[PDB]
Amino acid sequence: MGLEALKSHIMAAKAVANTMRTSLGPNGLDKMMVDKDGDVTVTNDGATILSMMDVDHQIAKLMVELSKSQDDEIGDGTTGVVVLAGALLEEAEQLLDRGIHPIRIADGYEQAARVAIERLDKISDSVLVDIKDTEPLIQTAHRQMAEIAVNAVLTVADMERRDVDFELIKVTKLIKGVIVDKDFSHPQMPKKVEDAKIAILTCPFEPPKPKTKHKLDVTSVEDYKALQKYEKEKFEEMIQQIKETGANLAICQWGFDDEANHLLLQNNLPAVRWVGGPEIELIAIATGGRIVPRFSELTAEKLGFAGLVQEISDKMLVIEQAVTIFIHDALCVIRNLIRDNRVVYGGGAAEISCALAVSQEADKCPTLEQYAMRAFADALEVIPMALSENSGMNPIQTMTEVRARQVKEMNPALGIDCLHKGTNDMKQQHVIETLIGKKQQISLATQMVRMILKIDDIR
Amino acid sequence: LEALKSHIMAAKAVANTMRTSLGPNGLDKMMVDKDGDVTVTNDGATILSMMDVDHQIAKLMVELSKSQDDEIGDGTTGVVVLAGALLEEAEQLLDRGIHPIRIADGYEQAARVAIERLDKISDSVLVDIKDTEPLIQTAKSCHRQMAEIAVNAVLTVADMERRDVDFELIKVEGRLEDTKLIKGVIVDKDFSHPQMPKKVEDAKIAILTCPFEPPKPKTKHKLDVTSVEDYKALQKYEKEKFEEMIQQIKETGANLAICQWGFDDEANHLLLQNNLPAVRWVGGPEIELIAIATGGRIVPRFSELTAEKLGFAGLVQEISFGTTKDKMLVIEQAVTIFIRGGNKMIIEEAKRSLHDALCVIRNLIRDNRVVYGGGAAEISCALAVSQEADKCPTLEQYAMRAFADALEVIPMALSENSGMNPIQTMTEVRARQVKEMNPALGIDCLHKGTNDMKQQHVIETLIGKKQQISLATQMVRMILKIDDIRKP
Amino acid sequence: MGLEALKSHIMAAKAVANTMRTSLGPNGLDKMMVDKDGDVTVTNDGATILSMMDVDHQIAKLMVELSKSQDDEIGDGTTGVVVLAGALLEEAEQLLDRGIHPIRIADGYEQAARVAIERLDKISDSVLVDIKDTEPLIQTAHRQMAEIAVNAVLTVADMERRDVDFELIKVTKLIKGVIVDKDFSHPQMPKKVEDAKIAILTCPFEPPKPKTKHKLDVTSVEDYKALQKYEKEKFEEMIQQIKETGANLAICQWGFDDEANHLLLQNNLPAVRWVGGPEIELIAIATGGRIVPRFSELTAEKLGFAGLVQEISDKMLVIEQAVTIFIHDALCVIRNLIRDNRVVYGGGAAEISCALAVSQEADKCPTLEQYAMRAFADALEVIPMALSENSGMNPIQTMTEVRARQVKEMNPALGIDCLHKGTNDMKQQHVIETLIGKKQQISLATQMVRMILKIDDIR
Amino acid sequence: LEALKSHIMAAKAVANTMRTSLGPNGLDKMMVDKDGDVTVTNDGATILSMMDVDHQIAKLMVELSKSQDDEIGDGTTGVVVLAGALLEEAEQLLDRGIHPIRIADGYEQAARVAIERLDKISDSVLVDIKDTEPLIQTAKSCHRQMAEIAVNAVLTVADMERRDVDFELIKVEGKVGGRLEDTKLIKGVIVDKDFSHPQMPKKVEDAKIAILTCPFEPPKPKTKHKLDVTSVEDYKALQKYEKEKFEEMIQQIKETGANLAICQWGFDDEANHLLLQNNLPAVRWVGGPEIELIAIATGGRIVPRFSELTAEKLGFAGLVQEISFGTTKDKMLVIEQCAVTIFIRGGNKMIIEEAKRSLHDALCVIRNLIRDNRVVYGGGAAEISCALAVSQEADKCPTLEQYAMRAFADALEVIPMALSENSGMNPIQTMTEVRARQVKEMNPALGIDCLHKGTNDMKQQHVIETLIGKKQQISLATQMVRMILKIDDIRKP
Ligand SMILES: Nc1ncnc2c1ncn2[C@@H]1O[C@H](COP(=O)(O)OP(=O)(O)O)[C@@H](O)[C@H]1O
Ligand SMILES: Nc1ncnc2c1ncn2[C@@H]1O[C@H](COP(=O)(O)OP(=O)(O)O)[C@@H](O)[C@H]1O
Ligand SMILES: Nc1ncnc2c1ncn2[C@@H]1O[C@H](COP(=O)(O)OP(=O)(O)O)[C@@H](O)[C@H]1O
Ligand SMILES: Nc1ncnc2c1ncn2[C@@H]1O[C@H](COP(=O)(O)OP(=O)(O)O)[C@@H](O)[C@H]1O
Ligand SMILES: [Mg+2]
Ligand SMILES: [Mg+2]
């Protein structure tokens, strides 16, 4: 429909926001979430929830990947993005009914977002780098996790400067590089492949069948044993091909089986089989190594320069042309701190101070953007309320009292305990959301709401 | 008669659909397609290419709107709204008892008046030295280089003395600051098997849409093989046939070849031993692209060609961009733009804004004049048509006025999409146009500015408007005729 | 049914007449007319409309091919035939209800048709031949069209006398003969085939498979390569067969492909492939050439004596045993003028004067044919009315005033402007329908109405 | 709780029905009734007087809208629109988690704020000389003499020295036929009906009136009778008896002064006969109203009898006449003992009923001004400034009443918004621009033209709403919203 499709999108998106409004904060609800013949997965943190669920309305699916591809791949806090977007749409409904044009509301939300974002610069608190401090800053996310995370991201970093990196990390011991499971297949092969030229091949190993009316006919010994011998020789063709360009180990998908793996032992070519995309592209990005669609047709070039490759009872390679932990959260936070070392206190406090700023700046504004900015303020104030109700406290009561204590005490920190044990100051408990986390959160929520507001008709 | 009114309503439905997407405040239209991805753009040029082929009048609304303004000018969403309004008023004129042939002829006469008035509003812009560069910043600091690269793109490829027409040699292959100038048309993929030479200078290109397979005879077959060397000699057989095709292509010109369909196997290896670095494999594009670019005709066979056909492209190279590689050729018997901005959405935005640059520059090269947009040219044209209708008798008198009121929908649509009052601001602007004698000002439209439209520098060129009006009136002339719709 | 089937046929045919009553004259309506998965085709001139549409009632299909096979293949004006037929049936309905027998009405329509036809001799106006005049007479159907059409039909004409010819013309440049597209396939062949004996063969090129339990069995080199070589030799059989009777180029449908086309080059036999009926029968009627169902079994005899055959980037042949234009309407008109050089003015004027004649002769008539002839007059007067309403004028008003001005001014010319700009005299505007066009039109319409009137029961 | 949302939705439905009839550009509402004629009017007072009485909450809004405003003040439509707005906002406050009693408390406090603010915006209007006349032009192009007759009507009949409370003893009668400028200056009270009989004296001057609520028939025992008349002589005896006892009451009235009498209830068959022959043109018949009018005007001491009276009671009227308007006739009298009544001849049948309500607005306005002579400027201006003050007090208040006060502030602004949309202007745009021009220019007067002709300043156009009109409007609105915000379960046995 023409316009009422807009209110329909508001309803459809705020439906999602209300679905995950309970899973916000530490007292969130787990959501059973099975999958077809699969099993149960009960967790907070909507990041993994948005991956699941269903494609209901294309706006409800638009809620995903805007809350995922950025905040899950850049920041950490996902649930706040969708909750905020839903609230903004809820107030934009009252503004629509009042007679305000949608695009004016989107613009007002942009300007208000500028006000809040620029504040977060004023609320910010810097943290030192290069030793310690970061470690005791991770206990928020029990002791060694901080240390291992620190040195893990310290080893893999730009640092001078530009301050960006990912993805060289995945999965208690320390770590020297990236590691893989499985084996080179047939332990008679050497376990010491140091200085290895890795041949990454996603292909089959078969005699190149010609294209013609085929139907082979064979009579016992004579032709049959000559067939087995034939494709064994043709296998030696590929074997001697991999050793001409490069040397030592290779990596292969699909089939091996048969004798085959035997022959490569006699030719000293300890390959590995078999795995799909992961562990292929892993060793590809790690050492070398590009990818070969063939099947014996390649130049190297391609092969990777991995320094050490060993086997322990899962084979692991070190010294790569890249360090990966062995047994999420803080690993992203540290990255943000590497980008900008400032933090703002969480628990909805930054939202409250941002709301006070957007509203204080909205009182002096002409035309219609005034109401848009005020609606934005009331939208940011949904985080403290949701946080309050998820723990059982009276929403508007605790929220209002805090919003007053922030201007009287001049403290953009205190607000929503929330754990029902504490001094409410939020300075203690050390609850920090960094800077890029919140700035990206607001930018993403406003981007969503603007998009939905522009859309109309749309099938 | 009711068939006509059915057409009226059915077409004004399309117009009323895309009436909200007009102007810079368009509403984007999701529009998924088939089993594939989505494409979100206002600017109805992409919206007519999708949606639903429902009524033959809505169909006719497309492909008259698709390949005429979108392939000559740039404005498209305006044409359909103009036609829709023309039919909305044409319904009123049908109720009065006027025959549709009379409303069509009247619409033609009125359209002539409007087109002739456009020349009166025109403002000239010089060519051959800048002046266009500062003129393209309006089409989208991501605006500085776009004007430049587009300028030299159409300057390198143009008739220029004179007649001033050229298209199509320009395309784009997806930071913007890393967007590169261009020396020719460029391709992706590889020549297959990097053992091949990367310097194919003075290349004779052999374009083959054929498959490479030994000629299977036509007879009851059931081929059987006793193995040992009955199998190996079959391999050697079609290896000898592949080899028989290799030097058969090398007979008239060698260098590189371009092919579709299958290769695989060793095959390419044999071609390396004979030194024929071909490429594989691509469909319509890059077959016709390199055909029109260098040489080169097309060879459907399969043991039937002479050269003749082969293209005399000067240089062909392979460049590695990061890890994966792409091969690109220069010096052709011809230049095409290239962009890489990362994030994948930083392009397709630059592309859609760049196409407007080539279109506007080509329109300015054909005739170097502009009229100020924002619906003001429509208002001055409406005042012209109506001024002509007050001094005309009989029935065309009413048709012309209906045409005027139909031209005033663009300022109204531009006003309503920005949140202003549609008829109020429209009437106020039309007043200030005769009072101040200024065929320029009207519809802010961005809600920020001085309303003068002389500033903000919004230009629709000339053939943009002339084609928009001529096409809207041509469409309406068609729909106003016809009836029945057989559909066997 | 017995009789009411007659009124049903009247309704069914006048339904068609009313369908195309709007598309008459210059202000006709285009009619969308798609076709299954095809595209749109919007034009006046019902000639191409009757080809489309649908087979509804066998009388509605009887309306076709009587309006097509003659007036589209002889005259030009198709829509007037069906409109007239419908009107005649409409009046024949009132005559039926009055108590008149059908066959009497058909006879009366015949006699009335004689009156009108014989008039057209009195209304006629002669036009000179052999130079010019015809050219400025074609601008009705912008300058060169008259010239090219004139000399095109001048080159192909009997002229002494009997004055008939078609079809040697089809499809800006002048023309020396009939032309074809495609190529001789494989440009190594000669482009100069002058003095060519064309071998028109619609057949395949395959080894004559014997009739017995077959199932070939082959083992690689030995028998397989001998199979390829075999059918290549068998191909040389047909090659050497075409060169024994005739020489040079041939023409073939169906398959060639393979090497095949290669071998004919080495034997100098530049044939062409492949096309269906058209371009086969075109070169057949042009040069020579009959048609050979075989497949190597023929005597020549058959082959055509085309003088020149060349190739330009589409191969074209000249000097044939026949001239065709290169880039409809006037080409038929000129033919009629070649048959009879007289013309009558159109725009319904000839219909009005014919009506005045049939009615003037009907006033003095006994028995029932009186009413039949009068109905015929009122039937011819539908052309000026339809012409009037299609432009928007008052039908009966303009029609009546003209029918009066024709007897007062004694001018079988003026009537229906129709373009809303002119002096109504019809002498100017130079609107001419020749003679055979109108005479054939009336004869065909009366033939239709007579047929329908005779028919009854009929399944 | 959802019972409250049902009430809030129905009440806002009524409000949305009448927010299009707000202001001078308001709409009509066909409003037919029973088996009778139709009535199309603005001014929701009559709308609420009929409407469609369905939901008990709508019934409550009618109850309280007529309870105070229609019976004392003037503005009624504004009350229901404002109440509707306050409810529309209090709904979102309910969803926010606030308790209803707290919302009603905040609405009360904010209401007191606005009420106290109207005094600061107030302006003064003089009395006693031709100053109110030019200020009646707001109530309605026939104004020039409408205002004149209005002030004349209310000032002639008023306490005035002092006490400043007076109403009634004045009515209006439209006789349908003429043009609105045919309205005439008025003297005494005027009633319909007729003396009955055509041979009656049609102009009785210097009349001493006898107002009676009694039947004219000689009473009967009302025991269980079977009255059977025997001889024909007794037939004549009966007729003679009642012929005499009908007269026993006639000269009984004439001994205390006669001229014309006045009767309720029955005026019998002969009766009027016997009264013509005795030259006593009485009249029949009318209920309580129009009886007490002539009672207070002249004399008159209504007599419950029936042959028992001494005069004394009879009044002193100078002239009584019977005038025929078209076909039907009404008898009107001049020169009373004093009591004035207005007369309207508008024609077209629909041109009257407009002048009656438009005049009623005049009497009410002038009465309110006599009670307290203060005015605030209309067109939503007082509403805008009131909203400004309420939001000002709201920014400085903590806890939950804060939100309720802000909701009240936004709820006041519906009057300028409704006034805006009903005139064709952009509702929120013009209203917002005016709310800015009221703080920048510091002028609690300008806003909403509303006639689309003027300087928007509203100081000119002199649109006045008095003070008790606004104070009672806000008090009644907040009273309604207070009641509706409580009340659950809606029993309704
Ligand atoms: N100790 C804490 N006290 C108060 N609030 C907290 C605390 N820890 C986390 N939060 C709040 O929880 C919110 C959302 O976190 P969560 O519900 O885990 O999902 P996500 O991080 O994906 O939004 C954050 O905005 C943060 O303010
Ligand atoms: N800066 C601007 N201010 C006012 N109007 C504009 C501006 N830019 C473009 N327009 C108007 O938008 C109209 C339509 O453009 P658009 O909606 O992009 O689709 P299309 O160009 O295909 O019609 C044009 O007629 C033009 O007048
Ligand atoms: N310039 C003209 N003025 C008046 N009548 C015309 C003119 N040109 C053509 N006609 C009329 O149009 C009639 C039909 O032509 P048309 O509608 O094109 O289809 P068809 O020729 O197949 O009947 C003719 O009988 C002729 O009298
Ligand atoms: N001339 C005027 N200009 C602006 N507003 C006016 C004017 N006259 C009346 N109004 C507005 O009309 C509103 C309501 O009056 P009305 O529609 O008659 O019904 P009610 O008086 O019963 O509320 C008042 O609030 C007043 O502000
Ligand atoms: Mg545009
Ligand atoms: Mg009122």
Short mmCIF file of C-alpha atoms in Angstrom, two decimals, chain A residues 94 98 367-368 370-371 385 396-397 400 403, chain D residues 92 96 399-400 402-403 417 428-429 432 435:
data_model
loop_
_atom_site.label_atom_id
_atom_site.label_comp_id
_atom_site.label_asym_id
_atom_site.label_seq_id
_atom_site.Cartn_x
_atom_site.Cartn_y
_atom_site.Cartn_z
CA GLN A 94 3.33 9.88 16.89
CA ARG A 98 0.85 14.78 14.16
CA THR A 367 10.29 24.53 12.35
CA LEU A 368 9.54 20.81 12.76
CA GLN A 370 12.29 20.49 17.13
CA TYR A 371 9.77 17.69 17.65
CA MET A 385 13.92 1.93 31.18
CA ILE A 396 9.84 5.40 34.92
CA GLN A 397 10.59 5.89 38.63
CA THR A 400 13.38 9.76 36.21
CA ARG A 403 17.88 11.73 34.96
CA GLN D 92 0.65 7.17 26.17
CA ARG D 96 4.67 4.59 30.03
CA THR D 399 8.90 12.87 39.55
CA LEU D 400 5.85 11.75 37.54
CA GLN D 402 6.42 16.33 35.33
CA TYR D 403 5.32 14.13 32.42
CA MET D 417 -4.00 23.03 15.61
CA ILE D 428 1.65 21.94 13.00
CA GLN D 429 3.63 24.39 10.84
CA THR D 432 4.73 26.10 15.67
CA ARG D 435 4.46 29.57 19.25
#
